[PDB]
Amino acid sequence: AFVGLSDSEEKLVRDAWAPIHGDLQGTANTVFYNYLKKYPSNQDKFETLKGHPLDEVKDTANFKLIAGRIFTIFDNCVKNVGNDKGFQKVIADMSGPHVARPITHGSYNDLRGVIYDSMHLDSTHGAAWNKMMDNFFYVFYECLDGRCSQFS
Ligand code: HEM
Protein backbone atom coordinates (compact mmCIF):
# COMPACT_ATOMS: atom_id res chain seq x y z
CA ALA A 1 0.00 0.00 0.00
CA PHE A 2 0.97 3.65 -0.23
CA VAL A 3 2.80 4.79 2.91
CA GLY A 4 3.49 8.53 3.38
CA LEU A 5 7.00 9.77 4.19
CA SER A 6 7.83 11.98 7.19
CA ASP A 7 9.20 15.50 6.68
CA SER A 8 12.72 14.30 7.59
CA GLU A 9 12.38 11.43 5.09
CA GLU A 10 11.11 13.78 2.37
CA LYS A 11 14.21 15.90 2.91
CA LEU A 12 16.42 12.81 2.80
CA VAL A 13 14.89 11.88 -0.57
CA ARG A 14 15.52 15.37 -2.09
CA ASP A 15 19.12 15.28 -0.78
CA ALA A 16 19.71 11.70 -2.07
CA TRP A 17 18.54 12.82 -5.52
CA ALA A 18 20.37 16.17 -5.58
CA PRO A 19 23.49 14.89 -7.46
CA ILE A 20 21.27 13.41 -10.17
CA HIS A 21 18.94 16.43 -10.23
CA GLY A 22 21.96 18.59 -11.08
CA ASP A 23 22.96 16.35 -14.02
CA LEU A 24 19.64 14.75 -14.99
CA GLN A 25 20.25 14.10 -18.68
CA GLY A 26 23.84 12.88 -18.22
CA THR A 27 22.85 10.51 -15.41
CA ALA A 28 19.90 9.27 -17.44
CA ASN A 29 22.14 8.51 -20.43
CA THR A 30 24.58 6.45 -18.33
CA VAL A 31 21.96 4.62 -16.23
CA PHE A 32 19.77 3.73 -19.24
CA TYR A 33 22.86 2.48 -21.09
CA ASN A 34 23.98 0.38 -18.13
CA TYR A 35 20.44 -1.03 -17.80
CA LEU A 36 20.25 -2.12 -21.44
CA LYS A 37 23.82 -3.52 -21.29
CA LYS A 38 23.22 -5.57 -18.10
CA TYR A 39 19.66 -6.63 -19.16
CA PRO A 40 19.73 -6.67 -23.00
CA SER A 41 16.34 -8.39 -23.44
CA ASN A 42 14.82 -4.97 -22.66
CA GLN A 43 16.28 -3.15 -25.67
CA ASP A 44 13.72 -4.83 -27.96
CA LYS A 45 10.84 -3.32 -25.94
CA PHE A 46 11.79 0.10 -27.37
CA GLU A 47 10.76 -0.02 -31.02
CA THR A 48 13.06 2.87 -32.01
CA LEU A 49 16.11 0.97 -30.58
CA LYS A 50 15.13 -2.53 -31.72
CA GLY A 51 17.45 -4.26 -34.17
CA HIS A 52 20.64 -2.20 -33.64
CA PRO A 53 23.79 -2.77 -31.56
CA LEU A 54 23.47 -0.98 -28.18
CA ASP A 55 26.77 0.89 -28.76
CA GLU A 56 25.38 2.11 -32.07
CA VAL A 57 22.22 3.59 -30.53
CA LYS A 58 23.77 4.95 -27.31
CA ASP A 59 24.91 8.19 -28.96
CA THR A 60 21.63 8.87 -30.77
CA ALA A 61 18.90 11.45 -30.22
CA ASN A 62 16.25 8.76 -29.78
CA PHE A 63 18.23 6.94 -27.12
CA LYS A 64 18.81 10.10 -25.12
CA LEU A 65 15.16 11.16 -25.40
CA ILE A 66 13.98 7.84 -23.93
CA ALA A 67 16.53 7.98 -21.08
CA GLY A 68 15.57 11.60 -20.43
CA ARG A 69 11.84 10.91 -20.20
CA ILE A 70 12.38 8.16 -17.61
CA PHE A 71 14.50 10.43 -15.45
CA THR A 72 12.21 13.42 -15.82
CA ILE A 73 9.38 11.35 -14.31
CA PHE A 74 11.58 10.40 -11.34
CA ASP A 75 12.67 14.05 -11.04
CA ASN A 76 8.98 15.08 -10.84
CA CYS A 77 8.23 12.34 -8.33
CA VAL A 78 11.05 13.69 -6.10
CA LYS A 79 9.59 17.18 -6.60
CA ASN A 80 6.26 15.83 -5.29
CA VAL A 81 7.55 13.52 -2.59
CA GLY A 82 5.70 15.63 0.02
CA ASN A 83 2.43 15.76 -1.95
CA ASP A 84 0.92 12.28 -2.15
CA LYS A 85 -1.82 13.19 -4.72
CA GLY A 86 0.73 15.06 -6.83
CA PHE A 87 3.22 12.17 -6.66
CA GLN A 88 0.46 9.69 -7.54
CA LYS A 89 -0.68 11.84 -10.48
CA VAL A 90 2.81 11.99 -12.04
CA ILE A 91 2.86 8.16 -11.99
CA ALA A 92 -0.78 7.74 -13.04
CA ASP A 93 -0.21 9.90 -16.12
CA MET A 94 2.96 8.05 -17.18
CA SER A 95 1.36 4.62 -16.50
CA GLY A 96 -1.14 4.71 -19.40
CA PRO A 97 1.40 4.22 -22.20
CA HIS A 98 2.84 1.19 -20.31
CA VAL A 99 -0.45 -0.60 -19.56
CA ALA A 100 -0.60 -2.43 -22.88
CA ARG A 101 3.19 -3.03 -23.10
CA PRO A 102 4.50 -6.59 -22.45
CA ILE A 103 7.01 -5.58 -19.78
CA THR A 104 7.47 -7.72 -16.66
CA HIS A 105 7.65 -6.53 -13.10
CA GLY A 106 11.13 -8.07 -13.21
CA SER A 107 12.20 -5.61 -15.95
CA TYR A 108 10.82 -2.62 -14.06
CA ASN A 109 12.49 -3.74 -10.84
CA ASP A 110 15.78 -4.36 -12.65
CA LEU A 111 15.72 -0.65 -13.65
CA ARG A 112 15.01 0.35 -10.05
CA GLY A 113 18.09 -1.64 -8.99
CA VAL A 114 20.38 -0.02 -11.57
CA ILE A 115 19.22 3.40 -10.29
CA TYR A 116 19.76 2.31 -6.65
CA ASP A 117 23.20 0.96 -7.43
CA SER A 118 24.28 4.18 -9.23
CA MET A 119 23.30 6.37 -6.21
CA HIS A 120 25.49 4.57 -3.65
CA LEU A 121 23.31 5.85 -0.78
CA ASP A 122 24.11 5.35 2.92
CA SER A 123 21.49 3.43 4.87
CA THR A 124 19.57 6.46 6.25
CA HIS A 125 19.13 8.02 2.78
CA GLY A 126 18.59 4.56 1.30
CA ALA A 127 15.75 3.77 3.71
CA ALA A 128 13.98 7.02 2.74
CA TRP A 129 14.65 6.47 -1.01
CA ASN A 130 13.20 2.95 -0.78
CA LYS A 131 10.04 4.25 0.97
CA MET A 132 9.54 6.58 -2.03
CA MET A 133 10.32 3.86 -4.60
CA ASP A 134 8.03 1.40 -2.83
CA ASN A 135 5.28 4.03 -3.18
CA PHE A 136 6.28 4.61 -6.81
CA PHE A 137 5.90 0.98 -7.77
CA TYR A 138 2.75 0.37 -5.67
CA VAL A 139 1.04 3.25 -7.57
CA PHE A 140 2.51 2.18 -10.90
CA TYR A 141 1.57 -1.50 -10.52
CA GLU A 142 -1.99 -0.63 -9.33
CA CYS A 143 -2.31 1.52 -12.48
CA LEU A 144 -0.89 -1.24 -14.72
CA ASP A 145 -3.60 -3.49 -13.21
CA GLY A 146 -6.43 -1.07 -14.08
CA ARG A 147 -6.81 0.26 -10.54
CA CYS A 148 -5.42 3.73 -11.25
CA SER A 149 -8.62 5.58 -10.36
CA GLN A 150 -8.19 4.99 -6.61
CA PHE A 151 -5.56 7.79 -6.54
CA SER A 152 -7.72 10.35 -8.39
C1 HEM B 1 9.65 2.39 -14.03
C2 HEM B 1 10.40 3.61 -14.59
C3 HEM B 1 9.87 4.14 -15.92
C4 HEM B 1 9.44 5.40 -16.17
C5 HEM B 1 9.41 6.56 -15.17
C6 HEM B 1 9.05 5.47 -17.57
C7 HEM B 1 8.59 6.60 -18.20
C8 HEM B 1 8.21 6.67 -19.53
C9 HEM B 1 7.78 7.88 -20.20
C10 HEM B 1 7.66 9.25 -19.54
C11 HEM B 1 7.53 7.54 -21.50
C12 HEM B 1 7.06 8.45 -22.63
C13 HEM B 1 5.56 8.44 -22.86
C14 HEM B 1 5.17 7.10 -23.43
O15 HEM B 1 5.05 6.16 -22.60
O16 HEM B 1 5.09 7.01 -24.66
C17 HEM B 1 7.81 6.11 -21.66
C18 HEM B 1 7.53 5.32 -22.80
C19 HEM B 1 7.98 4.02 -23.01
N20 HEM B 1 8.50 3.22 -22.09
FE21 HEM B 1 8.83 3.73 -20.06
N22 HEM B 1 9.23 4.23 -18.13
C23 HEM B 1 9.74 3.38 -17.18
C24 HEM B 1 10.11 2.06 -17.38
C25 HEM B 1 10.09 1.40 -18.58
C26 HEM B 1 10.73 0.12 -18.79
C27 HEM B 1 11.49 -0.67 -17.69
C28 HEM B 1 10.51 -0.20 -20.14
C29 HEM B 1 10.99 -1.44 -20.97
C30 HEM B 1 11.71 -2.50 -20.48
C31 HEM B 1 9.74 0.86 -20.73
C32 HEM B 1 9.33 0.90 -22.03
C33 HEM B 1 8.70 2.00 -22.62
C34 HEM B 1 8.30 1.97 -24.08
C35 HEM B 1 8.70 0.84 -25.00
C36 HEM B 1 7.97 3.32 -24.35
C37 HEM B 1 7.90 3.99 -25.78
C38 HEM B 1 9.32 3.82 -26.58
C39 HEM B 1 9.82 4.48 -27.88
O40 HEM B 1 9.75 5.74 -27.99
O41 HEM B 1 10.40 3.72 -28.71
N42 HEM B 1 9.54 1.81 -19.76
N43 HEM B 1 8.19 5.66 -20.44
> Domain boundaries in the chain?
6-152
Contact of 71 with 20, CB cutoff 8 Å: yes
Q: Tell me the CA–centroid distance for residue 96 and ligand 1, in Å.
A: 10
Q: Confirm if 76 and 20 have CB atoms less than 8 A apart.
A: no
Distance separating alpha carbons of residues 136 and 36, to the nearest angstrom:
21
Nearest atom, ligand 1, residue 136 CA:
1
Closest C-alpha to ligand 1, atom 42: 98
Closest by CA position to 115, among listed 64, 75, 87: 75
Q: How far apart are CA 152 and CA 124, in angstroms?
A: 31
Whose CA is closest to atom 18 on ligand 1? Answer: 97
102 lines ligand 1 (CB under 6 A): no
Instruction: For the domain covering 6-152, report its CATH number.
Output: 1.10.490.10
Resolution in angstroms for this experimental structure? 1.8
Which long-range contacts does 30-33 make (Cβ < 8 Å, 24+ apart)?
Answer: 30/118, 31/67, 31/71, 31/114, 31/115, 31/118, 32/63, 32/66, 32/67, 32/70, 33/58, 33/67
- SS3 state of residue 2: coil
Tell me the technique behind this structure: X-ray
Q: Is 101 a known ligand-binding residue?
A: yes
Distances (CA, A) of 94 to 34, 71, 87, 99, 141: 22, 12, 11, 10, 12
| Distance (Å) from CA 98 to ligand 1 centroid | 7
Q: What are 127-131's contacts with CB under 8 Å, separation 24+?
A: 127/9, 127/12, 128/5, 128/9, 128/10, 128/12, 128/13, 128/16, 129/12, 129/13, 129/16, 131/3, 131/5, 131/9, 131/13
